[PDB]
Amino acid sequence: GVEITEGVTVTAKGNTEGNTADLAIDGDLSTYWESSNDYKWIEVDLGGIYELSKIEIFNKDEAVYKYNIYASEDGENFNKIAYKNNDNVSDSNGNMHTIDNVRAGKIRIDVVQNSNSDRVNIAEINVFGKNTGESLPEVKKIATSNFSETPWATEYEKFNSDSAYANEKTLNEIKNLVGRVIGREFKDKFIFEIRDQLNGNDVFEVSDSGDGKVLIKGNNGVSLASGFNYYLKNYCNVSYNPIMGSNLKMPETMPSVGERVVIDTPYEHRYALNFCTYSYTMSFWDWDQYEEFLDWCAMNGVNLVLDIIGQEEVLRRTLNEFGYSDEEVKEFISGPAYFAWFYMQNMTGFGGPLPNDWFEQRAELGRKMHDRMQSFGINPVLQGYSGMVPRDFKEKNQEAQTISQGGWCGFDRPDMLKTYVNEGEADYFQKVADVFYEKQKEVFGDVTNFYGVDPFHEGGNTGDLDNGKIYEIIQNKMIEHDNDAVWVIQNWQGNPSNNKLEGLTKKDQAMVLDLFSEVSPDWNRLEERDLPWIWNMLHNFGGRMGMDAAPEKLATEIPKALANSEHMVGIGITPEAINTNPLAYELLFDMAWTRDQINFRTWTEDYIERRYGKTNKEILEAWNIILDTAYKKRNDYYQGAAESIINARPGFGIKSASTWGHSKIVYDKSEFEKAIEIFAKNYDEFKDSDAFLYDFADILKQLLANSAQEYYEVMCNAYNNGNGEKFKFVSGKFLELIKLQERVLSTRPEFLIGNWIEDARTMLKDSDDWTKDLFEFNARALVTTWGSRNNADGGGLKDYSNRQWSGLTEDYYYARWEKWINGLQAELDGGAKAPNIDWFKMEYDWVNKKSDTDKLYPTEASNENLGELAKIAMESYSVTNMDKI
Ligand SMILES: CC(=O)N[C@@H]1[C@@H](O)[C@H](O)[C@@H](CO)N[C@@H]1CO
Numbered sequence: 001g002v003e004i005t006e007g008v009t010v011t012a013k014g015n016t017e018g019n020t021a022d023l024a025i026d027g028d029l030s031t032y033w034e035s036s037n038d039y040k041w042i043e044v045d046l047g048g049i050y051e052l053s054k055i056e057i058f059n060k061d062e063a064v065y066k067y068n069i070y071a072s073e074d075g076e077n078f079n080k081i082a083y084k085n086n087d088n089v090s091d092s093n094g095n096m097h098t099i100d101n102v103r104a105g106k107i108r109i110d111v112v113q114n115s116n117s118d119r120v121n122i123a124e125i126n127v128f129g130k131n132t133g134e135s136l137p138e139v140k141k142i143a144t145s146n147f148s149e150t151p152w153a154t155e156y157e158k159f160n161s162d163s164a165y166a167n168e169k170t171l172n173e174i175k176n177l178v179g180r181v182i183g184r185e186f187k188d189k190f191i192f193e194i195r196d197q198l199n200g201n202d203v204f205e206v207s208d209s210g211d212g213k214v215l216i217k218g219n220n221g222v223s224l225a226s227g228f229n230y231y232l233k234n235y236c237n238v239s240y241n242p243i244m245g246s247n248l249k250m251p252e253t254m255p256s257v258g259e260r261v262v263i264d265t266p267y268e269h270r271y272a273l274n275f276c277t278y279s280y281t282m283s284f285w286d287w288d289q290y291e292e293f294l295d296w297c298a299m300n301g302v303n304l305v306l307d308i309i310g311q312e313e314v315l316r317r318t319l320n321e322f323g324y325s326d327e328e329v330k331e332f333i334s335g336p337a338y339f340a341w342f343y344m345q346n347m348t349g350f351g352g353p354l355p356n357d358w359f360e361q362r363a364e365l366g367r368k369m370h371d372r373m374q375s376f377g378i379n380p381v382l383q384g385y386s387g388m389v390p391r392d393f394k395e396k397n398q399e400a401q402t403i404s405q406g407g408w409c410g411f412d413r414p415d416m417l418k419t420y421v422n423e424g425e426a427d428y429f430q431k432v433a434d435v436f437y438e439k440q441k442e443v444f445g446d447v448t449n450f451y452g453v454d455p456f457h458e459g460g461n462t463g464d465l466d467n468g469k470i471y472e473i474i475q476n477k478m479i480e481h482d483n484d485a486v487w488v489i490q491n492w493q494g495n496p497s498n499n500k501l502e503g504l505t506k507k508d509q510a511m512v513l514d515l516f517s518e519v520s521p522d523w524n525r526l527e528e529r530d531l532p533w534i535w536n537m538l539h540n541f542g543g544r545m546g547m548d549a550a551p552e553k554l555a556t557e558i559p560k561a562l563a564n565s566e567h568m569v570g571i572g573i574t575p576e577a578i579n580t581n582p583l584a585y586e587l588l589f590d591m592a593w594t595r596d597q598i599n600f601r602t603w604t605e606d607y608i609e610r611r612y613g614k615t616n617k618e619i620l621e622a623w624n625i626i627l628d629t630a631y632k633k634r635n636d637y638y639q640g641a642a643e644s645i646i647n648a649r650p651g652f653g654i655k656s657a658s659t660w661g662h663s664k665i666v667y668d669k670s671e672f673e674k675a676i677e678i679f680a681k682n683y684d685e686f687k688d689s690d691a692f693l694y695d696f697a698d699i700l701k702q703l704l705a706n707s708a709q710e711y712y713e714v715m716c717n718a719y720n721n722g723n724g725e726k727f728k729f730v731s732g733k734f735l736e737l738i739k740l741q742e743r744v745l746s747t748r749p750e751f752l753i754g755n756w757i758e759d760a761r762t763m764l765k766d767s768d769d770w771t772k773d774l775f776e777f778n779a780r781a782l783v784t785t786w787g788s789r790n791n792a793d794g795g796g797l798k799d800y801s802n803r804q805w806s807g808l809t810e811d812y813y814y815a816r817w818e819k820w821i822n823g824l825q826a827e828l829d830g831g832a833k834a835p836n837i838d839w840f841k842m843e844y845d846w847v848n849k850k851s852d853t854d855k856l857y858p859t860e861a862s863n864e865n866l867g868e869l870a871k872i873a874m875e876s877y878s879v880t881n882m883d884k885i
């Protein structure tokens, strides 16, 4: 094990001025590399492959550093060979790590923590090993297939050109949906038929075949699956929701339909998904989860779906034509949990770089999905182009004209190409837009006419440019590459302004999603300008959880809008995550199949019976309590469910966990608790229904969140009044309340942080330790600090995506409240005034832990008895009995 003192080089992706990467290997403890951004790692090339025995690391000062060390012997796979995670200070002796004679040609050191500073540093790194005499192999450049080369193109064109082949494909796939949803044994109890549209509208039919089979007709795959769904819900008491709880118990014999049914929808489009859904929910989904979602979409009538899968390969091909290497593209693109804000032009780089094999795998996932969407008749919304480029685009393309977009929550927005230039100037918008659309075809082929792009989303800068001309040129360029193109435009807090929208010269080739129609509708100005538009329920913000829904508005306002408009072309959901309140989403898509207002109370009565497989007068009573409290119609502005005090940074006078959220419970808390009492009383009868268990946990965790808020206010008066003994008692019950909450959360697999993290770590096959640790960082950061310090704090993003999740509650939310409570108690006991707590440092310490070295979170839910937990909460942690407590 001889020290390697020749041929050693190093790179980094960032450094503060005069603290370059090479200063970590110059044999001088007085010079150091220091990080300047969130790339906190350096990569050492050893000038050959050595079997390493020791790695020695010196820091620039005496802080507590934590870091992870990776090695590669093939040039591609960097696996973890050592780490420091104890709390020892660095000193002048350095830290020496034993390596077990691991072959390595390259080494990565990632300094994730410095107790003294946001920035990390390495003064010296020495490596000890024996030469093997071998050199690393040249690593294969990124290669991806053109669509036309693949079997996907063959199958896609065959569907297009052969109506008989396509109908057989659609009918066979619908049969496969039946098998996946309710069981293979039910596939041959259904006969599916393509029919025509009913006077220009999508339509389905359900009826008896004559021999005890169910005959379902529909004009395309979505209508057929919606007919299948209609039959399950109205004749089988069955309810399908692969994300939020199902009752799939089929009768012993197929129920007969009786009088035939024909049902159509007046909406050309039924739309689903926010850009944000691709991050807060779908970041680590595999094909199995996409297939389920599409089965559920088709069954709920969905036929228009935002689709950004594999767009990284589209952008790689595009930027490669303008002076960007693959490595530079990977630095530009974000990590896997941040594509929502990368493609909305809000942020770059953070969470990356993506692995090299990312690009082909995701292009293949996208092609897989377009085949299934084609079978069903679901239109994807691919990408438009508006001028997004990296900030160094002019450095590489000197004649290009760009506009700096400034910051977004402490992130650097990408630049924007000037949408038009002067005569004599080069028009790189035309150049890059031409390539972008052409490369998108190369990756996926002609799969849709709908394209989504949103310049100046939540900021940016229009420079000297005219707002209307900008939108005129973007649309014209889109139509140039697809004559039937429809630009799908988000409508969010009054933007894009009327002046922007009036620049659209082809109104029929634009479609505006009114993003927030169930709380802050903004479609009148779209309707006035004869712009096709869609009525959308947003409902969910950041995946933040709680009992919250607007069923009365859905049942009334949607048909009212259709009766008072001419350019309402559909309805949709725009949730930032799909993880809460399945009633809201079931009801929205149901409103596609009526032109009249419906009764939301009686609809809910039918819904819960098929959701639980059974019903009675007590369960119905509890849900009418829910309808009169958490789901009651309101007329204020609010973003998502009222937040749980448990999830907020501890402090005085807290009114929300997120920056733009709300913690006020607008219903009577003791009234709502009656729903929990009724669920507990009927637990033993309904416990065989997983959806009942799902909803029980939902209302019970809402109960403990509601009561915790009351205990916090008491806890706060005790301190402000100096009553130490009372504070100790109230805060003791508070922490005990959270402990009980953790047990409730533990019962649901949907609430386990271990599932979120494991999905991140396993979403690619044959990925190295480096990639797994980096993906886990994406998963941990998104639901806590969101970004690093300037994003969480100065940017306002801290706890934006806070989740009432198992494990995360124990190790994050409880830990914060415990540390704050201990500080206040010491002060009240005659100690020094409680220090200010740098919350972000503590939070980022959890963000950077790894599942394979620190603590592995479970993927299996517990067996705790919700009914029993409900009794404990009512007796010892409730609002009703709070004065006895
Ligand atoms: C950090 C975040 O998730 N910000 C989202 C933004 O990305 C989204 O466009 C908007 C409308 O859905 N809701 C939030 C902003 O108010």
Ligand SMILES: [Ca+2]
Binding pocket: 023, 024, 025, 026, 027, 028, 029, 030, 031, 032, 033, 122, 123, 124
């Ligand atoms: Ca040095």
